[PDB]
Ligand binder design. Sequence first.
Ligand SMILES: Nc1ncnc2c1ncn2[C@@H]1O[C@H](COP(=O)(O)OP(=O)(O)OP(=O)(O)O)[C@@H](O)[C@H]1O
Ligand SMILES: Nc1ncnc2c1ncn2[C@@H]1O[C@H](COP(=O)(O)OP(=O)(O)OP(=O)(O)O)[C@@H](O)[C@H]1O
Ligand SMILES: Nc1ncnc2c1ncn2[C@@H]1O[C@H](COP(=O)(O)OP(=O)(O)OP(=O)(O)O)[C@@H](O)[C@H]1O
Ligand SMILES: Nc1ncnc2c1ncn2[C@@H]1O[C@H](COP(=O)(O)OP(=O)(O)OP(=O)(O)O)[C@@H](O)[C@H]1O
Ligand SMILES: Nc1ncnc2c1ncn2[C@@H]1O[C@H](COP(=O)(O)OP(=O)(O)OP(=O)(O)O)[C@@H](O)[C@H]1O
Ligand SMILES: Nc1ncnc2c1ncn2[C@@H]1O[C@H](COP(=O)(O)OP(=O)(O)OP(=O)(O)O)[C@@H](O)[C@H]1O
Ligand SMILES: [Mg+2]
Ligand SMILES: [Mg+2]
Ligand SMILES: [Mg+2]
Lengths: 246, 246, 246, 261, 261, 261
Amino acid sequence: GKRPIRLLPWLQVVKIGGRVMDRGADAILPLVEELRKLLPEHRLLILTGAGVRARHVFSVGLDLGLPVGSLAPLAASEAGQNGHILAAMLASEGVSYVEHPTVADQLAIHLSATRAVVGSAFPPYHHHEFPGSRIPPHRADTGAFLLADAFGAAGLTIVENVDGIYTADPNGPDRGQARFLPETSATDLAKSEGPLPVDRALLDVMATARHIERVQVVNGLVPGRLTAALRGEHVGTLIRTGVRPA
Amino acid sequence: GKRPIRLLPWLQVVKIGGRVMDRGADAILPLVEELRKLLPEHRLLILTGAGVRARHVFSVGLDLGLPVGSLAPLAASEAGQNGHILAAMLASEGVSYVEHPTVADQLAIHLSATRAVVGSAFPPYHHHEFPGSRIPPHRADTGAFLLADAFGAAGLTIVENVDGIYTADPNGPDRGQARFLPETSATDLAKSEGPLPVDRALLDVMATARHIERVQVVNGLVPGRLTAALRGEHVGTLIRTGVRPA
Amino acid sequence: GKRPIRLLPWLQVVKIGGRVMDRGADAILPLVEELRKLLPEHRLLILTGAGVRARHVFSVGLDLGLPVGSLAPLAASEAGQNGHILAAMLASEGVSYVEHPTVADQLAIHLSATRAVVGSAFPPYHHHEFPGSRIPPHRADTGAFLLADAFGAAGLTIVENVDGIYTADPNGPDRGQARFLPETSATDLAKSEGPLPVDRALLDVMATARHIERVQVVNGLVPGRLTAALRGEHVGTLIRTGVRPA
Amino acid sequence: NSTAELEELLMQRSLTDPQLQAAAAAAADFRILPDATVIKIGGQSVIDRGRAAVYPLVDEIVAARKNHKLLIGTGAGTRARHLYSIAAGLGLPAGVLAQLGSSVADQNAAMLGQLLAKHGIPVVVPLSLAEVNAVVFSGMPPYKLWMRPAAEGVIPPYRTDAGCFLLAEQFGCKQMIFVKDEDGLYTANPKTSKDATFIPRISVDEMKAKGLHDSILEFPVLDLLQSAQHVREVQVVNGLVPGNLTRALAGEHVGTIITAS
Amino acid sequence: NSTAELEELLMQRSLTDPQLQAAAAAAADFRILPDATVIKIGGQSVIDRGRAAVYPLVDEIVAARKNHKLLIGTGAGTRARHLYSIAAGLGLPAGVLAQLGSSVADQNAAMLGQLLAKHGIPVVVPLSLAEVNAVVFSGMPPYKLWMRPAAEGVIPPYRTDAGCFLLAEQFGCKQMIFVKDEDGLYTANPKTSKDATFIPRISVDEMKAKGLHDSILEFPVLDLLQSAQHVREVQVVNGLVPGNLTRALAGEHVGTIITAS
Amino acid sequence: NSTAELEELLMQRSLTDPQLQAAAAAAADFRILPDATVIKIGGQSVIDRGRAAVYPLVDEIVAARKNHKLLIGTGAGTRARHLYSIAAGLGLPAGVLAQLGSSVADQNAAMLGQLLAKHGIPVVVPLSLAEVNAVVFSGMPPYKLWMRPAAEGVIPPYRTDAGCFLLAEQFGCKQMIFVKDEDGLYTANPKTSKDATFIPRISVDEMKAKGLHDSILEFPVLDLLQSAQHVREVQVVNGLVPGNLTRALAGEHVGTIITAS
Ligand SMILES: Nc1ncnc2c1ncn2[C@@H]1O[C@H](COP(=O)(O)OP(=O)(O)OP(=O)(O)O)[C@@H](O)[C@H]1O
Ligand SMILES: Nc1ncnc2c1ncn2[C@@H]1O[C@H](COP(=O)(O)OP(=O)(O)OP(=O)(O)O)[C@@H](O)[C@H]1O
Ligand SMILES: Nc1ncnc2c1ncn2[C@@H]1O[C@H](COP(=O)(O)OP(=O)(O)OP(=O)(O)O)[C@@H](O)[C@H]1O
Ligand SMILES: Nc1ncnc2c1ncn2[C@@H]1O[C@H](COP(=O)(O)OP(=O)(O)OP(=O)(O)O)[C@@H](O)[C@H]1O
Ligand SMILES: Nc1ncnc2c1ncn2[C@@H]1O[C@H](COP(=O)(O)OP(=O)(O)OP(=O)(O)O)[C@@H](O)[C@H]1O
Ligand SMILES: Nc1ncnc2c1ncn2[C@@H]1O[C@H](COP(=O)(O)OP(=O)(O)OP(=O)(O)O)[C@@H](O)[C@H]1O
Ligand SMILES: [Mg+2]
Ligand SMILES: [Mg+2]
Ligand SMILES: [Mg+2]
């Protein structure tokens, strides 16, 4: 196999759900305070998802008939805006938003200059998004995983508005049926039909992953869960990717 | 009122007049030596104005009939050139010129990497400059103030080729009439007709300011005045903006 | 004469030959390990040349009839790719590739953020390359020298796939005739006809140089030679530029 | 004044000097794109409504570029309101909000541009206007962190009405048309008032005296209009009425004409 | 489905929800550039061969833009293979290799563009296609570090065949033509087999069943083709035969037609 | 030579090898824009003089693009001299001065472009030249910190005459016209000498032998001209004489023709 080297083995990647950001100050201010306290402990790439505004731009674009390659960058823009908001809240700590080309080619120098940077979790697929679904498949969870695994990062933690993955949507019509899953494999999730709090494409990129062995989904609405997850404590749903350790 | 947060509360902003730079080495070399000594004491955003070359491009552009939105970027270019000159003199200290998009979105990381950066004091109004006068209204003093107040900086100091504000142009035809003003309010200045060493638009943005309570105009041709001003010592004209303190 | 100031007097510039990179891991991995050990000792601008892929793009472009200003950027691209490869190998040390505009205007801040950066050694002559030869004259050695001398750097070391300069190509048809030259002047080299391991244009820019007094060409295939050269030890061919010291 | 006096003043006085300001005011007046019309396509009022609103306007744009040179700017709409609400609740300043709103106007420009791409019309000017007679652009001004705040609150006061107006003014365009979702200005907001009366024509001063400073247009735009050198009136029309943009471009007095004086 | 049900689902469900996915699938289908044809000019198969291969194709491109709108994408070729070998030997991941390959496709686009510049054809779309009826572009997808790796190895699986195909699909183009150095698909690689048989027409499923998943096209492209909404077949032709591109654009069945179903 | 020998040399020798250099010299010679003319509009000599100089040349440009393809480059002028003086007095090197001068040439390109925008002519090439028959560009070479210094002093030796010339040469243009403020070359500077004599035609070697190496053109341009493959003569004309540019484009021998040999 001779797996590729780890480019940034000391990096921790944290993906913040766009729906967490959508809650506004009530959710953002505690998260910002938790992130502030984490800056001296970890070297962080903080990546934001898109949330509800992307649903609105999908509503308009689908009504206009636009293809999935048109909707992809329109959604990515909302993740970038969430990133600019979050970075502004951390500016006094030396944190700025960095653009995709900079993340791809200059992340090492930026994390030498400061303890954390913020970027968009969506990948720059743009009009080269894959066809099949009218909804862009490669979204924020998928982008953050592709980047974390390409860098060989020490981890990826996904910060959600729920405790983790359930057997049904815990806010949906089958909500009394929904049982919490403390641990699962990506392959098991991929064989289930039904909604998830993570992109289905995340499960596919986990199958070809070369470094990241597990990803934890934790509730960002509960202070302390992100901090615990970054220390490896089990406070949400662990997803095993199928990368086998030494 | 619930005034907005301070993004970079520890930042000191210093605007260097383009007419100071126009004096060449005789003025620049002492200023560079003073700035060098300030780097360990303060976290500095150093912004340059335009000076005499913008007067020349206005002479040509007005002769060609060009509108105020055309003249605005042409003047801003001269402020950028002054910034590149000044930054080059400080390069051996780790100082570089940073472009407007970087100032707007990545200043925090840049001031984590190094003790000071240089940028253009003009705001990027470009062809969206306001009509009314044939001379661009939003110039270097105004841009530097908008940025310092938006960031919630600890101060803005304006470095001039005169001791401060007088009751008439101290180099003009009414020069024996000109009396020095140690302190004034922006509202009082705005109600005076006659020339000033600062943009009239500066007084307008001071009226809507949310953080900066005072701005000092000091003579950059006198070594030590910038250093004193950055420590709050009264060595020029203090302009009260009308932001009320706690 | 009143020679210009040194912008970055503490900088060491190292040019890595594209033909060294072309040897792949067998040459790159030892060089990366040597560079890693040099990061705490020196402030480095590491610039990569182009190598064999530029010969291929010249073969195609010349067959298509393209002028020298078309071939120049096509070759420069290969030097950029070598730079991205080398920087990736050093990313875990905080090293990234930086683009030409950043090298030209923001190098000081980047070397404040981290101990070394990588860039392309070719100069951005693009379609403004000089006519005369169908092969672009201002290549990687020339670009690296122009930059090192413009910055007033402490040195430029050229890392080659041979011990230095010989009196004939030591890999060519007159290879038994080839005698090693421990020291030479640029003026003496310029008066010789025959191939060299450095651009002929390097000798021309050495004649107008203002700071760099000597450039050493050393064998990057021998571990330790770059380290010794950066300490001034004579382990290859020294080229005297004709800049006279104090 | 005279060229020599102007150049003397430009060298010897501050730009704030009233004598220099007056001499510059006497300079000749070049219009860069005098035969072009700027149109703003509303975000909340048009694009956010989807196909039923956008497709007819696409058809009108395609028909109009035959005899009319068009600069077509986009508004922002509900997604910008959402961003402003999130950011305002965090205490972020107007300059930060400005960049957020710009991204939404850009999304709208991309959507409209893709519907016009097969007609040759790009999202961006001189070459496009010469060949395909139209371009699409995002309407937000580029002020970013240097946005002047309003007297109260953190919502950027110069948004997409201002951006489009300023481009029309600084290019010296012949006409500025705002495409919204109401027939024009009324004596009261027609969506929240039962018996509002339609106003075909009004001056900025009359609007202020009637309490209408902040009604169908960003009120800062009305002051820009009074300061303008080239665009001294604007027209506001209902983009939801078929053919309304075509008729306004033909000189029909649909909607409301707001004059500087 | 219905617009109201779709908007309800879009607000209240995860994008992963099968009910939301199905409602979005019922949306109308706009083609952005329906009258354009995408052509890929091979790197190893054409451009790397120099004048003898490129000049005749330049002539055909110039002749074709008279009656055909063309988006002309470039492959990468031997210099990208060299970069992949160097980087793979260092243990660099697919995402790093992706950017290296993009630079080579860009070099090829620049070379081809310079030969077409005097004909008005730029290297880059809507304005160019409206006026000069063609553009040149680099064929590599923009995925960079976010390239999905293959199941085995570090060679990027989505290279210039995929990039060109995806642009044809997302612009809703009428036709996708891959210009290579063989007459079409054979039952075996014609360069390494003596008695390979030519295949004029085949479906993706038939190719897989015959062991031809990775033959004249990147095998990931065949799966993209089966998922495509707009481009449901492709044609592969020999660019080294004079006039072959002209004939394919005229509807002649030169080469091999590969169908999604 | 032969293609096989060239490729052998390109792989096996240093690019400095005289045998490789000679084989590359035998390569075919493609002209990218053979029907275009490059014109330099002087900074100090034309644009700095304002309307009286610029407006007539605008009129001539508009008239000429009807039958002539034009690449119009701008000089820099007095503001660049000011920047050079400030920076030279600080001890800054030629590479720093180069970027300062570029900004001034860019300002001049923007001013000229805005006067031509309504005629379709952009500031920047292939698409513009195909459609509106002209483009405007800033004349400074892009060398920035990599500018080669002169033998003495820190003033960049390759400024806007060199930049425009090099573009004409590398695009293989048919003609290079420098538009200045004197009728042509004289035996002495006509502004500082009473009885200077006009020279209609001269070679570079003759200029050097007469002491005129650095007269109406940057002297480095004369050496570039002697090395050029495509542009082997240039014409220098007075842009202040009405119609002079039109007449030069029509083949009239106004001004001075300087030949490489
Ligand atoms: N099986 C499931 N387990 C947990 N949550 C689920 C499941 N299925 C659906 N959900 C829903 O997914 C929601 C999270 O929404 P989503 O994943 O779209 O937001 P996000 O991750 O914040 O957004 P983005 O992807 O833009 O960053 C939860 O609030 C929950 O209602
Ligand atoms: N009331 C006043 N008090 C002081 N100086 C005045 C006054 N009115 C005019 N001036 C003039 O303003 C001059 C400063 O010029 P100005 O403000 O344009 O330069 P600057 O600030 O260096 O330029 P820039 O705005 O481009 O940075 C002083 O030298 C003085 O002659
Ligand atoms: N006089 C000479 N002395 C030493 N080497 C020579 C001489 N003449 C030719 N050479 C050849 O030059 C080779 C180095 O090739 P070259 O200088 O093109 O590579 P590089 O410097 O790695 O490439 P690049 O310029 O793209 O960075 C040596 O291996 C040697 O064969
Ligand atoms: N007196 C009035 N007459 C007419 N309309 C009014 C009046 N007062 C308020 N309005 C409202 O102004 C609205 C138009 O402003 P709105 O900001 O929605 O336009 P827009 O250009 O679509 O904005 P954006 O592009 O920023 O989304 C109308 O929908 C109407 O409800
Ligand atoms: N069954 C087959 N039928 C036809 N050709 C085949 C088959 N199997 C393999 N090939 C090979 O596929 C090659 C075309 O693929 P190749 O990657 O060279 O094309 P390309 O588009 O030029 O690539 P790039 O642009 O990435 O350089 C042919 O040269 C042929 O040798
Ligand atoms: N022998 C000569 N014959 C003619 N003109 C000469 C001679 N020697 C010097 N000159 C001067 O050269 C000048 C033209 O050069 P100048 O640099 O002003 O041109 P420019 O293209 O406008 O420059 P820039 O664009 O860099 O401002 C003329 O104004 C003239 O005074
Ligand atoms: Mg989620
Ligand atoms: Mg001032
Ligand atoms: Mg070499």
